């Protein structure tokens, strides 16, 4: 299972999302839950860089299984909307694949 | 092959996103790339319906693997940045899986 730990500060701004584990839905190469979450993650991160002035702190296990996004300029509205979008997309995957991915707000 | 037709109007606002071939046979790579694009698309629509006030004309034919977003308030800046985030995410997929997905701007 992939777990997605989200931390949201006093003002409601998303400052960290930490995604850990593997989906364990199918075989390597054909796991659709992993394909879903990955496309949404990397898509969002790259879009932030590409469409806004925010430059997030990114740290990850380049062998798979661990990605960390820390927001820097948390006040950036464009970047915060992209992060929200990401969360809603991943929630959409959670509600149909219950046992492969978990969101936890802190 | 998944095709993604994107229509931009004279002012730069995204009008239409059409994805097709979702539910078609496909070659090696299709299952995951289709899972990636669809999680990004349906994720984006949900975000546009939950985070903004825009209510786009949406037509999903689950049987056809034909999915169509038509923008209504094209001046909704938030909806428009969710759409351009989706495009970026879709481009990210194209860059590495050129054989399974194609984007066409109209």
């Amino acid at each position: 299972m992939i777990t997605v730990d989200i931390t949201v500060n006093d003002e409601g701004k998303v400052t960290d999302v930490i995604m850990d584990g593997h989906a364990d839905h199918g075989e390597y190469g054909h796991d659709i839950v992993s394909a879903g979450a990955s496309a949404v993650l990397f898509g969002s991160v790259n879009a932030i860089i590409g469409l806004t002035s925010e430059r997030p702190d990114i740290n990850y296990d380049d062998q798979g299984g661990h990605f960390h996004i820390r927001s820097v300029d948390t006040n950036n509205d464009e970047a915060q909307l992209i992060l929200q979008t990401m969360l809603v997309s991943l929630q959409t995957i959670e509600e149909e694949y219950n046992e492969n991915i978990r969101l936890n707000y802190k | 092959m998944i095709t993604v037709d994107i229509t931009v109007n004279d002012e730069g606002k995204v009008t239409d996103v059409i994805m097709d071939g979702h539910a078609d046979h496909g070659e090696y790579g299709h299952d995951i790339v289709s899972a990636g694009a669809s999680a990004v698309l349906f994720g984006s629509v949900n975000a546009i319906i939950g985070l903004t006030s825009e209510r786009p004309d949406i037509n999903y034919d689950d049987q056809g693997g034909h999915f169509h977003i038509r923008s209504v308030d094209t001046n909704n800046d938030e909806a428009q940045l969710i759409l351009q985030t989706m495009l970026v995410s879709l481009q990210t997929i194209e860059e590495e899986y050129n054989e399974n997905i194609r984007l066409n701007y109209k």
């Binding site: 992939i2 390597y28 796991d31 979450a37 990955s38 798979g64 | 995951i32 899972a35």
Partner: peptide, 11 residues
């Protein structure tokens, strides 16, 4: 680059 199997295991 992008890896759609970033969150899938080996075994």
């Amino acid at each position: 680059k992008l890896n759609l199997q970033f969150f899938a295991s080996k075994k």
